[PDB]
């Protein structure tokens with residue numbers, strides 16, 4: 001029932017998911033001046049060399065690329081994290097125009113889109129168990145701005161026409177997510193939540209300072225996807241982002257000066 005429209009969007013979510021008004025909700029505005037540099041923070045460790053992508057899927061709210069998470073093949077650790085987190089999927093949030101689309105904001109600035117690489121803490125055995133724990137997930141967030149193309153994103157955008165509508169999926173093997181990372185792994189981090197229902201407060205957010213650049217043609221292909229299923233009135237999948245939520249009792253830490 002939930003979505004991003006006037007009658008079922010983010011302002012409505014608390015009715016089915018009361019935690020929407022909780023104490024550690026995401027996304028948030030990252031005030032860069034107030035975020036404190038924490039010299040105790042370690043470099044992020046991103047080990048994606050053995051990543052195995054499986055399928056790409058339009059789930060009615062975004063599109064996602066899903067990985068084999070049955071072994072430690074693609075893992076996140078270090079940074080603010082204790083232990084090892086397995087990559088299960090990545091997806092995007094984007095706007096109807098280039099001046100909006102990201103979920104997190106930086107000094108109130110919105111990016112055209114935001115990439116989320118979702119990982120779960122292996123000590124909990126599976127994603128379903130992990131989301132019920134305050135340190136169950138680590139989501140790596142990467143901003144997208146419009147300019148030069150990102151060659152590593154092209155194999156993704158070229159297949160989107162085959163998953164136009166809700167519930168469509170396709171084989172998507174041998175995709176290398178290293179091709180979506182910016183040069184620097186400098187990051188902000190804070191305790192937060194899933195940004196879609198069920199909005200569980202299970203996420204250590206790690207948001208990279210450096211955005212990746214994608215081309216207008218690449219983002220344009222995102223905007224041709226549909227929220228609706230095949231045979232329903234066509235509603236473009238655009239503006240599938242939750243706005244910034246109250247920071248409340250939280251400190252955002254920076255890994256860099």
Ligand SMILES: NS(=O)(=O)c1nnc(-c2ccccc2Cl)s1
Nearest residue numbers: 116118139193194195196197198
């Ligand atoms: N946008 S996000 O990465 O915070 C995210 N929000 N919800 C996610 C989710 C929802 C339902 C089941 C499993 C997952 Cl991983 S992932």
Ligand SMILES: [Zn+2]
Nearest residue numbers: 091093116195
């Ligand atoms: Zn997301």
